[PDB]
Nucleic acid binder design. Structure first.
Ligand SMILES: [Mg+2]
Ligand SMILES: [Mg+2]
Lengths: 82, 286, 82
DNA sequence: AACTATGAAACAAATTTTCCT
DNA sequence: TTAGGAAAATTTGTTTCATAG
């Protein structure tokens, strides 16, 4: 019975998913459409694709904590090395 | 209006002070619903924790309400994965009736003047809730995995003449509730030395459990906030050692250029993750 | 442009959009779930819902900046709402 | 001709619950 | 009841092999 992020939460993310930190109404719509596209196409074994991805990609570095390990993202490890 | 358990409270107000005399053992294996009771929380030597109030002359008896809350950092609240477990019958000196507030179980026990308001928490075991059931509850997002450390929280509401009621809360030392953790995690029982000049170079025989031979004591300095600034390997094993004893060489403090003594924390980390609980040590001025 | 969503991108977002920029595998599962629990229940009338939320809420301010009118988040005003 | 994206299988291994004396 | 052990379940984190733009 998981509650869905309300519109404001989603609408905000859509405005931030844009480097400019500002978007147009149509762009916001497309952010939502892309999200529909995703969860529609991958409603299978996603949880597996999440363990996979965290390990494959180098930008996800598991770090130890006084409590337990947790995942983080090396924003630098991303980008191009062309 | 009752006081929400999430609200922190002081241990004393003016002349009123609720203090834990004897803290509980470093670890208590909690039982699951599907099983039997795994006894009451105990105390190191052999007894059970003791709580006492300070500055209460009125002859009316009071109620100390015990409840299991978190430990690991942040604000102390009730623990979403654990519940206190009433223990009564045959033995058990201290008596208690249970109740459930909000979503937490709370035991209340008699705080009577005929015992200078000091009670021995001999009636509270710990029950583990299935991480599964509690993580998918109503609007809750606390991590349950690895989270198996709790604190015996104690509360008492003092009734004054003006009709006012100042609320006092405690918080026992962290307790390890997981059978696996209790077995594989490094434990420090009784230290040995607490002071030393910033220069370093002294022995401090440490005793506890899970002290293998590959142990390696580490030193660190935290802030009033929670930042790190020092982690110095503190070489061990002068030779051999006692199966659960450890002789480490106290490192050399950050810059040794200090006019005012500094209290510090040092733990024990066996496996690449199997860490111990932070300790206390005190350096001295220049 | 408008690249499609990848596991890497969503994962990065779930983590970065955390108080301390780090989360457990399970927490990332949770995040994805709330997203599933929306992008499968969206009414065939969401755009209206988005337009509705943009002005209705004081946390989404429209500015005449750049190319055309664009939407933006008044962070602190949004933070208040919570 | 790198570089990127997606996914099933099989391990390895860390943790939690259920079971058994 | 009150434990102590530990098998059974769950979970997490790595790699390898194949597919496509
Ligand atoms: Mg990685
Ligand atoms: Mg608005």
């Amino acid at each position: 019975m998981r509650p869905p992020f309300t519109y404001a939460t989603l609408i905000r993310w859509a405005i931030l998913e844009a480097p400019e930190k500002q978007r147009t109404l149509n762009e916001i719509y497309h952010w939502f459409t892309r999200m529909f596209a995703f969860f529609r196409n991958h409603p299978a074994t996603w949880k597996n694709a999440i363990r996979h991805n965290l390990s494959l990609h180098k930008c996800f570095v598991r770090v130890e904590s006084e409590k337990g390990a947790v995942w983080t993202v090396d924003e630098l490890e991303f980008r191009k090395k062309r | 209006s009752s006081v929400p358990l999430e609200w922190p409270l002081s241990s004393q107000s003016g002349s009123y002070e609720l203090r834990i005399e004897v803290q509980p053992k470093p670890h208590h294996r909690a039982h699951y619903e599907t099983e039997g009771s795994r006894g009451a929380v105990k105390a190191p030597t052999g007894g059970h924790p003791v709580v006492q109030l300070h500055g209460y002359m009125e002859n009316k008896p009071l109620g100390l309400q015990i409840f299991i809350g978190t430990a690991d950092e942040r604000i102390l609240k009730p623990h979403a994965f654990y519940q206190v477990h009433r223990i009564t019958g045959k033995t058990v000196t201290t008596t208690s009736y249970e109740k459930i507030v909000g979503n937490t179980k709370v035991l209340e026990i008699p705080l009577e003047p005929k015992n200078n308001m000091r009670a021995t928490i001999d009636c509270a075991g710990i029950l583990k809730l299935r991480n599964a059931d509690i993580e998918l509850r109503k609007g809750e997002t606390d991590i349950g995995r690895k989270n198996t450390r709790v604190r015996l929280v104690f509360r008492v509401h003092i009734p004054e003449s003006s009709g006012r009621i100042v609320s006092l809360q405690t918080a026992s030392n962290p307790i390890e509730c997981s059978q696996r953790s209790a077995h594989e995690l490094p434990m420090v029982e009784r230290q040995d030395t607490d002071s030393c000049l910033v220069y370093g170079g002294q022995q401090m025989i440490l005793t506890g459990q899970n002290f293998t031979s590959e142990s390696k004591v580490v030193f660190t300095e935290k802030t009033t906030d929670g930042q790190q600034i020092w982690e110095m390997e503190a070489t061990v094993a002068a030779a051999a050692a006692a199966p659960n004893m450890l002789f480490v060489e106290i490192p050399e403090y950050r810059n040794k250029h200090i006019r005012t003594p500094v209290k510090v924390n040092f733990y024990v980390i066996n496996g690449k993750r199997k860490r111990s609980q932070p300790q206390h040590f005190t350096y001295h001025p220049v």
